[PDB]
Amino acid sequence: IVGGRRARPHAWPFMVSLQLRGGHFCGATLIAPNFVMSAAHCVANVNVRAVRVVLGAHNLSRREPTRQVFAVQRIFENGYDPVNLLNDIVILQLNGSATINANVQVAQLPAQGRRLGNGVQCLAMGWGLLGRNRGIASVLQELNVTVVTSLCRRSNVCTLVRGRQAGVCFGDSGSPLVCNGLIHGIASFVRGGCASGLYPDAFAPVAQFVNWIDSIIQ
Amino acid sequence: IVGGRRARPHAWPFMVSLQLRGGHFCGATLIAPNFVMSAAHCVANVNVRAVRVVLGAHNLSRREPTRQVFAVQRIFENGYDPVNLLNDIVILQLNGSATINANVQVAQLPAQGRRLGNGVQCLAMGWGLLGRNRGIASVLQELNVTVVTSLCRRSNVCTLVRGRQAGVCFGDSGSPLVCNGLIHGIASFVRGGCASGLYPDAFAPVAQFVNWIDSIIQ
Numbered sequence: 001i002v003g004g005r006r007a008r009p010h011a012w013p014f015m016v017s018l019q020l021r022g023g024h025f026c027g028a029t030l031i032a033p034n035f036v037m038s039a040a041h042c043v044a045n046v047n048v049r050a051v052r053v054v055l056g057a058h059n060l061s062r063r064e065p066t067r068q069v070f071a072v073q074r075i076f077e078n079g080y081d082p083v084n085l086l087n088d089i090v091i092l093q094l095n096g097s098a099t100i101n102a103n104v105q106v107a108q109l110p111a112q113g114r115r116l117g118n119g120v121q122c123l124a125m126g127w128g129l130l131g132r133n134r135g136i137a138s139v140l141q142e143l144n145v146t147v148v149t150s151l152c153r154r155s156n157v158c159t160l161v162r163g164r165q166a167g168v169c170f171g172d173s174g175s176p177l178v179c180n181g182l183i184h185g186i187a188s189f190v191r192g193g194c195a196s197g198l199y200p201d202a203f204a205p206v207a208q209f210v211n212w213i214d215s216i217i218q
Numbered sequence: 219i220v221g222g223r224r225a226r227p228h229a230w231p232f233m234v235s236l237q238l239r240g241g242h243f244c245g246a247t248l249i250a251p252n253f254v255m256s257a258a259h260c261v262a263n264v265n266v267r268a269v270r271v272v273l274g275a276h277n278l279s280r281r282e283p284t285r286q287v288f289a290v291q292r293i294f295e296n297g298y299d300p301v302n303l304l305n306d307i308v309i310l311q312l313n314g315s316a317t318i319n320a321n322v323q324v325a326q327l328p329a330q331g332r333r334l335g336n337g338v339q340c341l342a343m344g345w346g347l348l349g350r351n352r353g354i355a356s357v358l359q360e361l362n363v364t365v366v367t368s369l370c371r372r373s374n375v376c377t378l379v380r381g382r383q384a385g386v387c388f389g390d391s392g393s394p395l396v397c398n399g400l401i402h403g404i405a406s407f408v409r410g411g412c413a414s415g416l417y418p419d420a421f422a423p424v425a426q427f428v429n430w431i432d433s434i435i436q
């Protein structure tokens with residue numbers, strides 16, 4: 001996240017860090033104690049068996065007893081287009097179930113079909129690239145943004161930080177966009193580089209995959 | 219295919235070669251003019267943007283005008299388990315429609331839940347390794363096989379050649395197992411090495427996926 005603020009320890013206990021080796025590479029969201037949601041692009045040309053799903057994290061540079069670490073057990077994708085990133089979402093079943101506590105909870109989703117209108121105020125987050133002058137985030141960051149329709153496919157929910165150069169960056173893909181309490185997006189792509197000021201960030205539209213997601217976790 | 223024979227040219231017009239910048243790495247089956255299915259594990263650690271879906275092929279070491287080449291436009295997976303290969307199936311939308319002809323035809327499928335019993339006679343095929351002497355096949359190969367239920371998961375359709383060392387090998391994964399003219403299987407995995415004479419070859423049970431497949435191909 002370029003130009004955001006550190007988050008209050010465990011303010012978003014549904015937030016998940018996906019790692020390979022000992023390093024973060026994408027975010028995800030806990031939607032059922034044995035299930036996460038992320039961007040399809042995130043798992044596309046990696047060794048999924050090696051992927052560690054870390055729950056309950058806050059500052060990746062430190063040891064954290066609050067963490068619950070899982071592995072991937074099943075993968076579901078519905079029409080992901082590798083060429084243009086249409087339908088950039090994947091549901092990952094875990095090898096076990098999270099212990100729901102203060103630090104780990106299931107986020108809630110929007111009703112199938114629920115469409116977002118230019119103007120709504122959401123919150124983006126991730127441990128992604130602070131920009132390019134210093135690498136990845138140690139502490140989870142958050143960013144107020146606004147839903148926008150200009151320069152956005154009808155197949156995406158997009159955001160924009162009005163007035164300055166700020167937005168999601170490498171390492172935030174797969175992270176959730178929270179609007180009035182529900183996951184309305186998963187971070188998918190940016191244009192003109194990160195935090196361009198010219199183009200809105202693009203998030204896969206969660207509300208469009210609702211019944212599908214449900215036919216899987218319920 | 220270890221211990222099989224050359225198939226007759228364009229004997230199996232639904233037979234597909236998945237290639238990465240000219241290099242065959244797995245087979246597939248044309249199930250609609252614009253959809254193939256193959257094994258999920260086949261596209262797991264490759265850049266799918268670079269994958270070419272090659273239709274109407276016979277001899278891979280030859281220039282072949284009968285061929286039609288498409289790219290992947292969309293991806294669908296339904297509970298693929300990367301750790302044990304359960305649900306080893308992927309449906310791939312193509313970036314266009316194949317021209318139906320002598321050398322290219324949609325295959326037929328079995329109806330949902332149509333299981334096979336010990337002893338049914340099938341035919342496996344593909345462009346994989348010839349055995350461990352001689353490399354990957356040039357000309358498409360075929361092999362008479364028999365369905366078996368011992369040393370097989372309930373969630374797999376499995377085959378075994380009796381009385382000799384023969385079976386599928388690297389390069390055959392994702393290829394169709396034809397039984398009584400319907401595609402009942404997608405080549406998935408082997409045990410004890412290729413053509414052990416000890417363990418049966420395992421194929422994803424297409425029939426258990428027919429309803430999901432129709433819903434994508436509709």
Ligand SMILES: *C(=O)[C@@H](C(C)C)[C@H]1[C@H](NS(C)(=O)=O)CCN1C(=O)c1coc(CN2CCCC2)n1
Nearest residue numbers: 084085168169170171172173187188189190191
């Ligand atoms: C993920 O982190 C996204 C953005 C949300 C940051 C990254 C991913 N790429 S990377 C290099 O693996 O981090 C996927 C796309 N991302 C981009 O930074 C990026 C670069 O160009 C684009 C836009 N493209 C892709 C879709 C159409 C145009 N996004």
Ligand SMILES: *C(=O)[C@@H](C(C)C)[C@H]1[C@H](NS(C)(=O)=O)CCN1C(=O)c1coc(CN2CCCC2)n1
Nearest residue numbers: 259302303386387388389390391405406407408
């Ligand atoms: C595909 O070509 C299969 C077999 C049908 C040959 C290969 C694939 N692996 S690859 C192309 O060599 O990386 C997928 C598994 N295959 C095997 O050769 C193989 C080796 O060990 C196994 C057994 N595993 C998978 C099930 C759990 C143990 N399969």
Ligand SMILES: *[C@@H]1O[C@H](CO[C@@H]2O[C@@H](C)[C@@H](O)[C@@H](O)[C@@H]2O)[C@@H](O)[C@H](O)[C@H]1NC(C)=O
Nearest residue numbers: 049050051052053069070071072095096097
């Ligand atoms: C679920 O997975 C946990 C993580 O396993 C560790 O990381 C994975 C990716 C593999 O590399 C594994 O070999 C590593 O040890 C386990 O530690 C945990 O016990 C598992 N939970 C279960 C099976 O109940």
Ligand SMILES: *[C@@H]1O[C@H](CO[C@@H]2O[C@@H](C)[C@@H](O)[C@@H](O)[C@@H]2O)[C@@H](O)[C@H](O)[C@H]1NC(C)=O
Nearest residue numbers: 120121122123143144145178179180181182
């Ligand atoms: C920045 O946003 C903060 C939280 O926003 C609200 O909560 C999140 C979880 C979402 O549900 C979102 O839709 C809500 O609006 C606010 O507390 C804060 O006021 C904001 N600051 C500014 C300057 O806009």
Ligand SMILES: *[C@@H]1O[C@H](CO[C@@H]2O[C@@H](C)[C@@H](O)[C@@H](O)[C@@H]2O)[C@@H](O)[C@H](O)[C@H]1NC(C)=O
Nearest residue numbers: 267268269270271287288289290313314315
């Ligand atoms: C469908 O794609 C065909 C194959 O294109 C070739 O392979 C893909 C993976 C890319 O690498 C591409 O740039 C390669 O040349 C095209 O040749 C074909 O025209 C396409 N047809 C469409 C889009 O209708």
Ligand SMILES: *[C@@H]1O[C@H](CO[C@@H]2O[C@@H](C)[C@@H](O)[C@@H](O)[C@@H]2O)[C@@H](O)[C@H](O)[C@H]1NC(C)=O
Nearest residue numbers: 338339340341361362363396397398399400
């Ligand atoms: C070898 O198999 C040949 C073809 O088998 C038939 O067609 C295939 C595609 C499947 O649908 C299969 O179930 C059918 O049996 C036979 O014609 C041939 O006789 C077989 N030979 C021996 C010795 O088994």
